[PDB]
Structures are given as C-alpha cells and as structure tokens.
Amino acid sequence: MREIVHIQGGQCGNQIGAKFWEVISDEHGIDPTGTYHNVYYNEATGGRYVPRAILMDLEPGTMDSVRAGPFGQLFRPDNFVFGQTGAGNNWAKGHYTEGAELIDSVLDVVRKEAEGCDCLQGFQITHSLGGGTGSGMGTLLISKVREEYPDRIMETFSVVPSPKVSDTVVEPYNATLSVHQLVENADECMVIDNEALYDICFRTLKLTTPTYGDLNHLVSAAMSGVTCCLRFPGQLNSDLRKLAVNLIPFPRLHFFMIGFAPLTSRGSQQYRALTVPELTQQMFDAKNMMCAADPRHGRYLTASALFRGRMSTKEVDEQMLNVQNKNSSYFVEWIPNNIKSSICDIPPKGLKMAVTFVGNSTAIQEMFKRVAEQFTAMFRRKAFLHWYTGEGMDEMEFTEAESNMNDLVSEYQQYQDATA
Amino acid sequence: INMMRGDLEDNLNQKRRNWEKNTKEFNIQQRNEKLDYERSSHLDNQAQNQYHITYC
Ligand SMILES: Nc1nc2c(ncn2[C@@H]2O[C@H](COP(=O)(O)OP(=O)(O)O)[C@@H](O)[C@H]2O)c(=O)[nH]1
Numbered sequence: 001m002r003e004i005v006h007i008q009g010g011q012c013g014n015q016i017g018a019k020f021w022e023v024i025s026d027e028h029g030i031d032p033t034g035t036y037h038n039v040y041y042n043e044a045t046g047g048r049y050v051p052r053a054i055l056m057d058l059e060p061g062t063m064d065s066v067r068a069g070p071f072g073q074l075f076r077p078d079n080f081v082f083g084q085t086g087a088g089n090n091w092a093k094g095h096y097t098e099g100a101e102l103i104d105s106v107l108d109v110v111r112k113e114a115e116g117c118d119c120l121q122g123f124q125i126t127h128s129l130g131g132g133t134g135s136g137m138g139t140l141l142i143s144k145v146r147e148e149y150p151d152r153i154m155e156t157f158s159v160v161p162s163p164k165v166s167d168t169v170v171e172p173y174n175a176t177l178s179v180h181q182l183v184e185n186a187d188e189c190m191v192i193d194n195e196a197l198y199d200i201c202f203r204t205l206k207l208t209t210p211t212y213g214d215l216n217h218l219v220s221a222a223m224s225g226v227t228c229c230l231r232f233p234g235q236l237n238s239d240l241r242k243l244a245v246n247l248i249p250f251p252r253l254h255f256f257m258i259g260f261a262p263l264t265s266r267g268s269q270q271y272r273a274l275t276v277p278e279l280t281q282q283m284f285d286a287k288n289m290m291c292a293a294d295p296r297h298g299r300y301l302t303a304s305a306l307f308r309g310r311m312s313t314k315e316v317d318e319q320m321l322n323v324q325n326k327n328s329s330y331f332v333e334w335i336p337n338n339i340k341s342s343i344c345d346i347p348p349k350g351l352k353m354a355v356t357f358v359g360n361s362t363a364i365q366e367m368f369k370r371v372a373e374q375f376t377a378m379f380r381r382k383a384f385l386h387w388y389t390g391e392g393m394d395e396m397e398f399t400e401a402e403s404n405m406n407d408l409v410s411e412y413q414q415y416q417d418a419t420a
Numbered sequence: 421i422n423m424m425r426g427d428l429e430d431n432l433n434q435k436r437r438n439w440e441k442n443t444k445e446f447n448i449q450q451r452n453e454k455l456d457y458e459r460s461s462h463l464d465n466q467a468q469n470q471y472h473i474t475y476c
Contacts, residue, residue: 045469 002121002230002239003038005114006053007106007141010134012159013127014055014062015212020126020220021051022071027224027349032071039231042116052113054079056106056141058094058133059086079113081106087132091174092391094136103140110145121230122240123154126223130161130171135178146185153244155188157223157258162193162292163370170384172374173398179368180401183252183408187244190226190256191364192219195292204287206265219290222260225348225356229306234344235313238306246340247302247360253411255364259289259357274353276315279307283357284323291364298363299332299416304340308354309347316341332362334420365412372405 008017024030024040031037034048041049051074055066060082066072083102087094114120123145127134142154158178161171182189197218201210229238248254261283264272272278283305286294307316320339324331331338348354378384379398389395 045473046466 001038002119003052003117004040004121004227004240005110005117005123006040006051007056007110007123007125007138008053008127009056009125009138009141010127010131011057011062012131013125013134013138014057014066016157016159016216016219016223017053017055017126018066018069018071019213019216020223021053021074022069023217023220023224024051025071025074030074032073034074050074050076054081054106054109054113056081056102056133056137057086058083058098058102058137059088060084061086079109081109083133087136089130089168089170089174090132090387090391091130091136091177092132092388092393094132094134095140096393097391099133099137099140103137103144106137106141107144107148110141114149120149120152122152123149123156124240125154125156126159127156128159128161129178130168130174132174135174139178139181142186143181153187153241154185155190155240156182156186157190157192157219158182159192159194159219160367160371162195162367163374164195164292165193165198167194170378170387172371172378173384173388175371176375176401176405177398179408180397180404183255183404187248187254188240188256189254190258190358191367192258192290193292196287196290199287199292200263200290204263206268218260218263219258221348222258222290222356225260225306225308225354226258226358228308228346228348228354228356229342229344232344232346234342236341236343238342242342243304243358246304247358249301249335249360250411252408253301253360253415255360257289257291257293257295257359257361257364259283259359261288261355261357262351262353263288274351276311276319279353279355280319280323283355284327289357289359291367293364293367295359295361295363296330298361298366299330300338300359300361300363301332301335301415302338302340303357303359303361304342306356306358307341307343308356309352310345311343311353313343316343332415334418362412362416365409368405368409372402372409375402 008014029037030049040052042052044050053075055075063080063082066075081102083098085098087099125138125142127138129135146154160175161167197215198210201207201214227240247256261279262274282288286296305320320341324339385395
C-alpha cells in the first residue's frame, strides 16, 4: 500500500542511506536482527523484516561499511549489485563505459522488487553529483526507470557540492553533466551540501568536531520526517504526490531545499521551549536549512511545512499566515497563499514535535550559477578534458549541457521578475 | 376471539425474533471459529517455514 523503493548509490549515497535505514529501524522499533522491539519493509519468515532497498557501486569497498555499521544484516544479499573496477571520480566510467554494463542488472533487480509491490507510490534515490559511481549510475538508472514507469514519480536526495568546501577538483564537470538530465526526468531534486551542515553543527549545535556521522544522521532524520506523514495517522495527511502538486508549479522548477527543526545542544535543549512559535522562529531563518544559498537574497515560489507530533491546527495555521504576511517581500506575490502545512499525529523517537520545511524557492538558482562559474574556467581552457573524451563520450554534449543549465537558471530569474 | 387472535400473533412474532437471535448467535460463533482457524494456520505456516529453512 503506497509503498516506496530505495536506491542508494555512490559513497555518500550509501553512507547516508545506511544511516537513514538505521534511523528508520530505530523509529519503527526494529533491532539490527530484523524484528520488532510495507511502506519501507517487507515481511519474511519468522516475522523477520527485509528493508526494500538496492545498493549499487562500482567498487565493493562500500560493502565493508554496509556490513560493519549497525543494521547491516537487514538488507538482502541479492540486493548488492557491485562492480569491480570502480568509476574513480569520473562520470564517463559510470554512465557510458562500465556503469552501462551493470545498469541492466540493476534494472532487473528494480523490476524484481517493484513487481512485488501492489501500489507503488514513487521512488527515492540518494547519491552525490561528482562521484562517478553515484552520479553516473544513479542518473542512468533514473533515465531508464522513468522511461519504464512513466506514471510513478522519483524524489531524489542528491547531494551537490558547494565550492565553499573543497573536496575534489573535477566536481563541476560531473555536476553539470548530471544536472543536464536531472532537470529532465526527475520531479523532486532536494539538494543538500556540506557547508550548510558544517555551519549548522558549528554555530547552531556548538559541536566540537563536526563529523560525518552526525551530519548523515541529521540529513537522514530530515529525509524521514519529509514523508513520515504517510507512515502514520494524521489530521491533514500527505504523500509523495501532495508535495508533487503543492511544490511543482512548472515541470522543471522542482529543485527543493530542505530544513529540519528543532536543533539544539544539551544546555539549549534544557533551557528552551518546544512550541509552534519557537519552531516557526527556528525554521524560517536562513541557517536552519541545508543549502549554502542565502534564501533572503531571493524568494520562495512555494513552501511546504510538514509538522509532526500533536498540536492545535488553528495555532500552526495562524502562525503560517502571520509569518507569511510579515515576510511579504521575501515571498512571491504573483501567487496567492504560497505556503502549505500538513500535520501527522505521531512525533519522532526522542522529542514531542518535529518540523520538516521543504521549499521550492528561487534562491538556489544562484547556486547553479557559482558551479557554472567553475565550469567555464575548467572548459574555456578545455582543462581536464583528456579523461572524459577518452571514454567514448563525445565532447560536444558537454557544451549543450551548459546551455541547458542557462535555460534552467534563466527561468528562475524570469519568475523572480513576474508581477500581475 | 379478537383478544385470542392478538395473543397468538404476538407469540408467533416472539418465536420469530427468538429464532433470529439464535441465528445471530450461530453467525458470531462462526466468525470467531474462522478467526481461530486463520491464526492457527498462521502459526502452522511459521512452523513449516522454520522446519523447511533450518533444513540444512
Ligand atoms: N554528508 C557526507 N558526504 C560525503 C561523505 N563521503 C563523501 N561525501 C561526498 O561524496 C562526494 C563524491 O561522491 P562519492 O560517492 O564519494 O564518489 P565515488 O563513490 O567514488 O563515486 C565526495 O566528493 C564527498 O564530498 C560522507 O560520509 N558524508
């Protein structure tokens, strides 16, 4: 019933997905053995539970991770489709040359896992954008499956690299290459970066050494809180499509920002309240989101707010109306009531409230801009091109890919200029 | 004679309602025996699955 599949590729994708399965298991009350202590799990003999997920990569080193970290005995042994060469940070190695050889087996596993469903509500994938395995194989899989299941919809939590944090020196290439077709046949691209998470765990949680563990934990908890309102009874329920109408005004303006609330450290947790006013004051700022794009330098075409726990619908509703008609400038005026709310009846494990703030804004367009910046300074000189064209991939494509990007960002700016 | 006919028809209707409630007793017993059936069959299924899987 309204079941969801799980594809996780690339190093970061696999890490975050393992953490997400951990958080879900600790939410539905599932210990690492697969017992209780159909939206995500499937039944198995002796009351065991199998997470509905497929793990793919071109180097099986990640196997170590998904077998060492907690909740590693949950996944299916047939759902580990691994390569041997490794894409090695290059997109071509994972979309034309080698990934094009195991993508068919991944498609076969996807078919064997989706036919076991009875009402498939959508897809959700997690992957990087420069990681050859991740970006390449995930984009190829998205292409194939959307060319296979036109009715269903995909909601990908791709993790773009922001240049404020330097990881590798070939990101812009793979980033633009994947964006060229991620705006094509994907309906919810919730982008995430690393600078936002570092700023969060420094100036919002006072953590000492922000480590990948807690970063992934935070983004996974947000990923869960996104769709939780379908996993339980609610007063104003939602799904992965009630977002696909409230948050996609145009078939390409679908790039989403994600924010989680509440977020505090121990002392702060002690000395503060947990109510609609405080959560609202906590979520509409800039540095409670997971995108290094200052939203107050743009607007929000639409903004959904999935609350969790139990409250008075009048209170959250009046708070939304008030925060809108006070931030009238930072919101878009040619659309009426651009905000949406949705309330479930079960809070997460640990607290008494929760807030997932999803936003189809017009600020993250600037993000593409800065990435495009590097692209030009890595293409005008044709630098680091002798690793791409040497794998069958024709160079010409790259050019038009960049052109496509323009259209995208253009649209955003154009809609920032519309009036009535 | 009018009083007698009234009394006789009253008794007949009472007998009707009595048999109806008897049939409802039977129907509830039927439903609960079916639930017994399904739970016992589920436990038997788990038993046979353990027996087949632990068959090394
Ligand atoms: N939040 C988070 N991001 C990561 C992590 N590991 C890698 N990333 C990002 O993932 C980027 C590239 O994707 P990756 O899957 O590692 O490359 P590939 O596996 O070799 O194809 C890297 O440049 C990292 O910035 C992690 O543990 N946590």
